[PDB]
Design an enzyme around this catalytic site. Sequence first.
Site, PDB file in Angstrom:
ATOM      1  N   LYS D 263     -65.295 -21.362  -8.270  1.00  0.00           N
ATOM      2  CA  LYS D 263     -64.992 -21.398  -9.693  1.00  0.00           C
ATOM      3  C   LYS D 263     -66.003 -22.249 -10.458  1.00  0.00           C
ATOM      4  O   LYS D 263     -66.736 -23.057  -9.871  1.00  0.00           O
ATOM      5  CB  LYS D 263     -63.568 -21.922  -9.905  1.00  0.00           C
ATOM      6  CG  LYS D 263     -62.525 -20.934  -9.340  1.00  0.00           C
ATOM      7  CD  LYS D 263     -61.108 -21.487  -9.637  1.00  0.00           C
ATOM      8  CE  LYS D 263     -60.025 -20.540  -9.086  1.00  0.00           C
ATOM      9  NZ  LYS D 263     -59.957 -19.263  -9.929  1.00  0.00           N
ATOM     10  N   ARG D 337     -53.686 -12.681  -3.149  1.00  0.00           N
ATOM     11  CA  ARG D 337     -53.231 -11.363  -2.748  1.00  0.00           C
ATOM     12  C   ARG D 337     -53.340 -11.170  -1.224  1.00  0.00           C
ATOM     13  O   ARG D 337     -52.518 -10.461  -0.632  1.00  0.00           O
ATOM     14  CB  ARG D 337     -53.992 -10.269  -3.517  1.00  0.00           C
ATOM     15  CG  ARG D 337     -55.515 -10.222  -3.189  1.00  0.00           C
ATOM     16  CD  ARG D 337     -56.272  -9.376  -4.251  1.00  0.00           C
ATOM     17  NE  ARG D 337     -56.422 -10.135  -5.497  1.00  0.00           N
ATOM     18  CZ  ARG D 337     -57.147  -9.710  -6.535  1.00  0.00           C
ATOM     19  NH1 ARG D 337     -57.802  -8.540  -6.453  1.00  0.00           N
ATOM     20  NH2 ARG D 337     -57.241 -10.464  -7.628  1.00  0.00           N
TER      21      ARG D 337
HETATM   22 ZN   LIG Z   1     -58.376 -17.645  -6.395  1.00  0.00          ZN
END
Ligand SMILES: [Zn+2]
EC number: 3.4.11.1
Lengths: 489, 489, 489, 489
Positions: D263, D337
């Site tokens: 990120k 996920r």
């Molecule tokens: Zn993530």
Amino acid sequence: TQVLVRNGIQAVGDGLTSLIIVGKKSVLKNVTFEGKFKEVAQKFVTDGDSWNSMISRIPASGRHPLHYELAHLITVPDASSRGNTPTNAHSIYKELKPINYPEDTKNVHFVLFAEYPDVLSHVAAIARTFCKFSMKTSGIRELNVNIDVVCDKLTNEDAVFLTDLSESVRETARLIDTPANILTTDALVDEAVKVGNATGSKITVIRGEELLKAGFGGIYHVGKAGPTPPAFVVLSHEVPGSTEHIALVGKGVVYDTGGLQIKTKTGMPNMKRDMGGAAGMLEAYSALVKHGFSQTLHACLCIVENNVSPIANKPDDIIKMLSGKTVEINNTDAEGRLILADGVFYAKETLKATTIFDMATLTGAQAWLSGRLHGAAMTNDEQLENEIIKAGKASGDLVAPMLFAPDLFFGDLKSSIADMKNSNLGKMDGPPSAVAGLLIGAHIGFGEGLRWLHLDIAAPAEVGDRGTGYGPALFSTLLGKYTSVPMLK
Amino acid sequence: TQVLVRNGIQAVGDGLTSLIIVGKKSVLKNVTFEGKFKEVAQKFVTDGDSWNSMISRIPASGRHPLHYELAHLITVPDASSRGNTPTNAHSIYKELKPINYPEDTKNVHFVLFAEYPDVLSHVAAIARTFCKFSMKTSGIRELNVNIDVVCDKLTNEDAVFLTDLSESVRETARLIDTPANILTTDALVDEAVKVGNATGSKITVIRGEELLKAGFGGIYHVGKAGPTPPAFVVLSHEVPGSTEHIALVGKGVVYDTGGLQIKTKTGMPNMKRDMGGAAGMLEAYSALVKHGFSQTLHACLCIVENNVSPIANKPDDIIKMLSGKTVEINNTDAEGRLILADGVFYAKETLKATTIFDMATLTGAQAWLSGRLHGAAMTNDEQLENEIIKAGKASGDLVAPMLFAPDLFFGDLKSSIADMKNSNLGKMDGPPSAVAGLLIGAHIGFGEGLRWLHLDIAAPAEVGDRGTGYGPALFSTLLGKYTSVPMLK
Amino acid sequence: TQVLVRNGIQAVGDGLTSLIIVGKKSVLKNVTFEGKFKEVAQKFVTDGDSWNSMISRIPASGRHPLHYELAHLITVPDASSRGNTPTNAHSIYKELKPINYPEDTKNVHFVLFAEYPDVLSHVAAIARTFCKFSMKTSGIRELNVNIDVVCDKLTNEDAVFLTDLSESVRETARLIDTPANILTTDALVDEAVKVGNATGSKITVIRGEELLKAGFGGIYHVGKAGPTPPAFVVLSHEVPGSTEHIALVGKGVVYDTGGLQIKTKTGMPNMKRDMGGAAGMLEAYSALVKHGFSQTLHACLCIVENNVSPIANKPDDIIKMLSGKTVEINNTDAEGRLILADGVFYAKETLKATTIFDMATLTGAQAWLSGRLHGAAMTNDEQLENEIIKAGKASGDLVAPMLFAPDLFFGDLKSSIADMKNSNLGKMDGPPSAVAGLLIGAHIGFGEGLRWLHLDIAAPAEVGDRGTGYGPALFSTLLGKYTSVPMLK
Amino acid sequence: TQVLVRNGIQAVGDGLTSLIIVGKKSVLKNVTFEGKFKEVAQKFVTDGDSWNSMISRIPASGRHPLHYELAHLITVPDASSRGNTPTNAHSIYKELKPINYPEDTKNVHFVLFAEYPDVLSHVAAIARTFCKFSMKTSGIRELNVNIDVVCDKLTNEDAVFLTDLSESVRETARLIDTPANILTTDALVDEAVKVGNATGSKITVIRGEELLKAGFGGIYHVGKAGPTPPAFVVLSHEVPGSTEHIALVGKGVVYDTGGLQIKTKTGMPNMKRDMGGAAGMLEAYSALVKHGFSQTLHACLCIVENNVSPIANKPDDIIKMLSGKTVEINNTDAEGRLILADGVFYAKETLKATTIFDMATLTGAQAWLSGRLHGAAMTNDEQLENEIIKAGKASGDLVAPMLFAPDLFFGDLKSSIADMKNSNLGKMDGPPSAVAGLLIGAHIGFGEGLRWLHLDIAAPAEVGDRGTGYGPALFSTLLGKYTSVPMLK
Ligand SMILES: [Zn+2]
Ligand code: NA
Ligand code: NA
Ligand code: NA
Ligand code: NA
Ligand SMILES: [Zn+2]
Ligand SMILES: [Zn+2]
Ligand SMILES: [Zn+2]
Ligand SMILES: [Zn+2]
Ligand SMILES: [Zn+2]
Ligand SMILES: [Zn+2]
Ligand SMILES: [Zn+2]
């Protein structure tokens, strides 16, 4: 290239013919190799046994060549998810769009084995692959296309409507594919006026400085820095005593540079397609009015080019909209919603419409809400929401719902110095596509007292380098109960 | 400042004189401190022993001061790599460009000890450091420069040519360095016409709306949003019965904002230099025609400003080129190749040229292919490729080859709706600089039946804040066999 | 799936068979529908007339189905540009790679009509489409592939070599396609050692801390932050008295995260493929040594993972290379050139190689120089440059030349505090791909006294999601004169 | 701070008391200033007339001070849009969250005038503003909070449940607000186990290498580079003979750095909140099981930290999931996920659950679909979709529907070499939030044969710098019919 839809397999012209057979697997499994079908297919398929053998082998869906260049079978899947259309019409487009016909092909013959509920979406999907627009200087071929529908219930009147729908689909796509140096605001006004004349409409054109004087601040101020002037075009089909009064308002941004908040180097190509809403509403109106449309109906086209000059909109500018409300423009590229705010207000106030649809290639954000196949619908009316979703499924022009919550989300457009801003350039509480629609609805009390539906079609209006012609099929199925067409009734 | 090249050491004027001695180490090692050289150098170098002592100490290359402000020795390396020029002429520029002369200097005297094969590149390298253009409001000095070449084989006619080449080099650089608020399209047309008159050329100027009417869609549509109009200028030197018919086509973008796909804040400065191709072709033509050029020769200058308004090119626009072919513009900043497509087609079709060169500051990608010192050449003719590389080595205007593969790479420019796009904004199979050249060649069958060479000079046309004057030296050596100049023959 | 190349059309096994016919248009035009060809094709093609009729209709090139699922004709173009290979072998890959075989296919039968100079590239192109690697958990099918070459001059020994080349191609691609969580440094060492054993090589493995102790600063420091340790593997094929001593040095970065100067979110996927150079050199060595290679030959594999931890390389770090020279690392993602600097020095110093090739997926910049089909070759030896370009054309593993100019470009890597930096993060004078190669060559005097060739294959090593298996075909044609293979001699 | 909910206005403790009165305008209009209300309010409001005068003046909604520091009236709007909750519970949070109590306040007394359908959402909204978590080293105050509900129909058992719901809400938020250097995977396992013990659950903990050995490839491979090991925790409430078997699967990413696809500098703060799904499912389970939950119920918590080391996931890695299917990881930040694919498969296969909910702070894209107040629900079951939307309205934990179309959208995750990829880093046909959910569902046949609902709560799980405690209120209303609680039944 001409496209005719016929009720039943018939002969085609003299001349080299490409044959494409189309059906769901379950339907194809039950087709007998005999009669008119055998007559047409036996050039390419040996006999019944070879037919049956092939149908046994081929998977649940796909495309299979029946010749080295002239012929194809397209198998459509039978199964579908609840978010899809049970027609699976997109599968036809996926398999067919790649097909090329030999240079000297004269005729393309489709044999479409479709059950009655599938016919309209399947026909439209085939029509979309016959792209009218090209400026290639060699290799251009015009074809004679016959789509022969094999379906018990189909009437001859249905086949007329499906031919007209095919034309409306291909016209929408042609308008979209045409570059804006050719399809200027003037040229799109002329296109709408042609349909106005053909349909015997009452035609109103308000153009250039007349828009400013008449108070259309959204349409005027957006389009004032275009190379040709902004316009608002109304085609009206007035039916004395009709119970409904329906407006189809379309975003006709013939090119969107973004304005002074300019689009990027990679963001700006494709922006000729920013008039896809106006094209689709115009061609929907055309298809409906050709078939005895029993209610009062208006097409309202907001036609501008959003370009860059010292007189263009600048972020911070405050303008007065047709509604009398003020809007602080903080995003010159959020221009569709400004022009539509005027179109929808006009439809309410001047036309007295009580059902107002607006359709627009409005936001890049739309794909993050409903994906690339579904238009995103936001409406004050729950029943209309269900009805348009149902119409999307029946037409193949898919529609998914947006949240309708002006109380929760309209605060995203708060302004200290005007009645509202046109966008929010930071974090907002609403889905950005919904907030974009709420700017439009803020000028008609979010639909209070009537039915208002906003439909964002940015992504479903195109696949690859081509317009899909989205809109005519959707509105034909949605509003077709007011026509004389048996399959719509 | 005036630059004269002389055959042999001679006296210079009265007035304060700066002296710069230039030579390869091996040549300098063999120079005797006697005669005319001693006469010139003994102000700064004591005697022969001190001379010899110094030459012993100094390294393989560099710059050494011979006085606190008035004098320098520049040692050029003897060794060179195969990708370099064996002249090492760039080393002269590197060492000399930083030198400043005291405010009250009247004369700069170069003593150039160069072997015959080095003379032209070495002279050009010195000439490039005398930048004509300045708008400083104090401190401006004009100097009398004499470059005295010490070389047995040099003739007096050679010295005339080298003086003319020096002028062509400095003129190319002046045109490049001049900001575009001064060097407009009109001003560059005037500059070309001046050379046209001086050379007794047949002059054709097609300007503004005349370009549109005559079918020059590339030149017209690129330049239509400039503050002064687009132009195409042809200077023709027609030689009845000549065996060759050679065109020099130059990109004359007097300023490139990028167009509506606008350049960035840091990308746009320097874009006055986007006419370096036209300047270099014009000044090459001038130098060749001054020296009895025996073949038919044309300079074709495509002169536009690429700017931003509601009438400018927009990505998606489709235009018809002079060739009759259509181009979908998906990149308004890929404008040089559009204008050159018309110039090269004109040279083939109208001028009947059978050797067509185009030279352009075309792509930022060029530096990733050939670096900053080598122009990148793409040609259908292998022998011409070898010959221009050889000319680059002999002139010091270096040239490296690009791949020529229209079959492999032209598909990068595929368009669904026009004959081609002008660029590819994603991944492509070709080197981007090659693909850019193929857009040009696509309008003349990639050179079929003739010799076509495209030369991208974006990076070698400049060093730091200054034009290098690339082009005249290259074409003088390449095409000098058709002149009367002994050293070129 | 097994691939066998045979000399002449022969029967294939029992079991469902897919048939693919391949040829240039001019060759196909002359094929008679009789004999063994008729025997194989008449399942799908009716008779001679229908054959001839089809060949008449089909264009200059493409792919045409001969059945709804089981059969295809691939037409290869006859024409080619000078930058292409005249084999047009890439056209086979383009048309064939998309083809899928029905789930229950047992056999794929190729009938390859190729002239002798085309056979090797055409066979390799077909082999590349049989991708070994998959981790799908359903649908996996193994096929029996026979490539039957119809060519007068082909020998049975040629067919053995072509089968081995097919294997080397598919092995290179398998190694490339395998994700790095499986193909770790350890796993790639094991793969090289397997080939070492099969070829009867002398095998050297220097691993982990042994690299540090032995002075391999490039290999060690790059790989020290991998999850499994760095290694250098040498396979030696020593031929007493051989005139040549050839090293194949390969970049084996099993995964490249970029290091602490980390790759971006979209830049890092695909970086399992950063060992494509090592795979291609290993499999070239294998193919050559299988065929009586008469000269001394070494494969030198530099095998590391470039990952992120507190012990990883950091920009500013200065390391000592195997050469004894110091390098300031200013770019941790310019890691291939560090490891190759050690491999090439080892090949010179320890192995006494006098021809040193290094091949690497080195730079993203390579595509801007030579595009996506051509490896970019930089060499101190002009004749070798011509010879490898010729080998690229004959093999279909295309090669384009880079500029060789250490004098002009090595200054791009100047360091104030070490002997050089490994990269330049700003503007540089050289093509970045050339500068990357010069870092390698700086540790062997840029090839002085020997022949050194650096080959950057970043883009041609892959198409779409798959390794191409580039390298074995190139080196088989380049060095095949030292084998017993008739078609290479 | 302790929060007690009581049925009716009662006295509070000795000590300085802040008073906050809360109601809809229409309800407040009908409140009589008498009795217990007068007793509580007359410190701040003079008498009945002054009360009535104030209620007349204040707008449709807002917050009005009744004292310089100690007291407030919060007016909740009566009107609501169809996309909102008719409770308008968010309005309470908006007005209340800013309120600060004087340093020496002992008691906060709420008088909540709410109709029966509003009580639960209104209580929860008040509870959310009492943030448990702070590491301030001065100024920390614990308060005694009484929420006195004035509502005829409320029972004493209801008040117990509402107190427990308040605790579950505040606990969820506490877990979310705690930084991950404190709330590690180990600490979150301990938190879940505490609830496991309190509820008399059967507790399963599978941790570290046990996950790898047991085949939990998603949970293991995501969490293997955390500072503390990955875990899967199951709390089971088994009811012999129950008709339903319900699993609550939660994403417990205690911190998300993004992994090697890291990120950004501004993207990474807030990523302690990436376990909000696990916290909300855990605390929902707690509230339900405290109240006689009559069906079999499981909480399944997938607890990992997604961090950066040489052993972390890398894009290109292919792993085998608990389902046995392979996933190509092309996005290490699409990690939720992966872990949920294992949790949902476990719930189906091992627990035999026939209703499987998964809830996760899954995607930034979720806000573009459903905005910041609505979780986005994707389910194979239309009735469940309607039911959870209804539960969102009744609880104030709003839910909006996503499209369910695995046939249209699962192709976005196509992989050449594994059964699927975990994400698509380019253009995709589905809404990205839907595609993210489909990766999870692909491991249980998209819910075939059972009911599966995925709920993405990335944005509604937080406002400003604080967790909202989303989840317990939603599931209490959704599944409360299986409890003994009168107001839920
Ligand atoms: Zn993530
Ligand atoms: Na043609
Ligand atoms: Na001065
Ligand atoms: Na299968
Ligand atoms: Na304090
Ligand atoms: Zn816009
Ligand atoms: Zn727009
Ligand atoms: Zn440009
Ligand atoms: Zn330019
Ligand atoms: Zn790297
Ligand atoms: Zn690398
Ligand atoms: Zn996450």
